[PDB]
Structure formats: C-alpha cells, structure tokens
From a paper:
Olfactomedins comprise a large protein family (PFAM: PF02191) with seven phylogenetic branches. These multidomain proteins contain a ~30 kDa olfactomedin (OLF) domain and are predominantly expressed extracellularly in a variety of tissues of multicellular organisms, particularly in vertebrates as well as selected invertebrates. Here we present biophysical, biochemical, and structural characterization of the OLF domain of a second glio-OLF, that from M. musculus (94% identical to R. norvegicus), and H. sapiens noelin/pancortin/olfm1/hOlfA (npoh-OLF), which are both neuronal OLFs, but from different phylogenetic subfamilies. The OLF domain propeller blades are arranged radially around a central hydrophilic cavity.
Gliomedin, also called collomin, collmin, and CRG-L2, is involved in the development of the peripheral nervous system and is phylogenetically most similar to invertebrate OLFs. Human and mouse glio-OLF lack these corresponding Cys residues, and the disulfide bond is replaced with a cation-π interaction involving Arg 476, at an equivalent position to Cys 409 in npoh-OLF, and Phe 541, located within the C-terminal loop immediately after strand E-21. By contrast, key amino acids present in the expected metal binding region in glio-OLF render it unable to form a coordination sphere for Ca2+. In both mouse and rat glio-OLF structures, an apparent Na+ ion is coordinated by Asn 423, Asn 471, Ala 472, Leu 517, and a water molecule. In our structure, this ion assignment was made based on lack of stabilization by Ca2+, Mg2+, or K+ in solution, unresponsiveness to Quin-2, fit of electron density, and refined metal-ligand distances consistent with Na+. In glio-OLF, analogous residues to the Trp/Tyr pair are Asn 417/Asp 486, which are hydrogen bonded; this cross-loop interaction is further stabilized by hydrogen bonding between Asn 417 and the main chain carbonyl oxygen of Thr 484 on loop D-16/D-17. Thus, the available glio-OLF structures appear to be in a closed conformation that prevents access to the central cavity. Comparison of hydrophobic interactions among glio-OLF, npoh-OLF, and myoc-OLF reveals at least 20 more hydrophobic interactions for glio-OLF.
Author numbering: 299 to 542
Amino acid sequence: SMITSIGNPAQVLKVRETFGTWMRESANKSDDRIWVTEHFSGIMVKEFKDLPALLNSSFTLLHLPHYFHGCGHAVYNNSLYYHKGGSNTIVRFEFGKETPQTLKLENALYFDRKYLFANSKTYFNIAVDEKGIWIIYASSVDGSSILVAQLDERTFSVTQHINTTYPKSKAGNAFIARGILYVTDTKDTRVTFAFDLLGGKQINANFDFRMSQSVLAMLSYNMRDQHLYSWEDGHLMLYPVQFL
Ligand code: NA
C-alpha cells in the first residue's frame, strides 16, 4: 500500500546542533531508548534511556569502531547501521559488542562532496521497513543515478542493487515505507517521486511533506510506530503518515 498524506508534525526537542540524527528501535520490541549523532562526522553516539532523558540531555556516550559520516544512519535490532567516513564501507555495529560487521558498496559515490543528498551532505541512507533493510546510494558509474541496495539481514550483505534511474540532482532526501521508496524535492517540502522497490517500477507520488523549508538533516521512516522521524535545523520532529 502507498502513502496518501503526511500529518502535522509533533516537535520533541530543539537543540543547538543544526545537523544530526535521532533514532529509535523499529523492531517489534519494548525498547524506549533513543540514539543521537551530531554534526556531519564523528566517532561518538549518545544513547538516551528514554524520551525524558533526551529532553533533559542525560545520555550515555558510546564510542564507535569507525568514524561516521552524514545523517543517514538507522538503528535496527539493537544495531547501528552507518556510513564509515571516507570509505564506501557501511558498518553494522551491535550495541553490546566489539566487532562490527561491514559491507562495501563498490560502485557508490562516497567522497569529494559528490553526495547522494547534498542538503545533508549524505552519501548513504540506511532504511528499515516492513519489506526489508535498504541502503540508498548514488552511482559512482554515472555520478547521478539513485540506487537502493537490498540487504540480507543475517549476513549483512547485498542481495540486489535496484536502479531507480532517478537523478540525485532532483532529490532532496528520502525514506522507505512498506517497500516503496519516497523521494523529496530539492526544497525538501514535497514528495515528488516514488519507486516500488520489489516491483522495480516508478509510481506516482505527489503529496506535501511539510510547510517549513528549514534545512533538513535526517528523514527516516520507523515501521514500529509508522511515523516519519526528522531532524530539521536542530528541531527533532515526528510526522504521522496516512496509508491508502
Ligand atoms: Na532519509
């Protein structure tokens, strides 16, 4: 099924950090924790035990095995998925463990400011939804096309590279819900492109995302509550979504 509209947002918090990510578990689990990264690069993640903890800036610091770049990470099943800064390596870091798993996206743009999403200086966007685990990236072959790697969860390996043919120059940002890729306009306020990942075909999508045009750092669908999570100019937002 497809998204027909996005509701008014709920703001959870405003921080000084213009760019960052906030993330919650999306696996069918009782887990109230929140994970945050700040800025476009670093080696630390802040873990909050719950929302009141986030509200009061009471966090545990977790040191990562590799520096992250960008704002396109995701948390799924007690693991952080993220772009290893300055490489085409994607890292899966399980929070109670030492050695992460890694995979390489050999034909993906990953340096020299040739971003997948320029607004957020992002090269890769990891997304988790009802139909699988996905890595959105931009081709280093033609330097333009948006692709989505479909993952195998157990092996943390790529089973398929899906070419949308959509040029990244038209994309503001994106998220994936129920196996459908949704891409925003360059102003990041409307969704103007969509792609049925398992059907391998474009589908019509034109609906408003938000009224604010403030810079958009992170945009991510969480299948556990079916809400859009975003980070907008230091504002942590939640959007409800309406399916057809
Ligand atoms: Na996104």
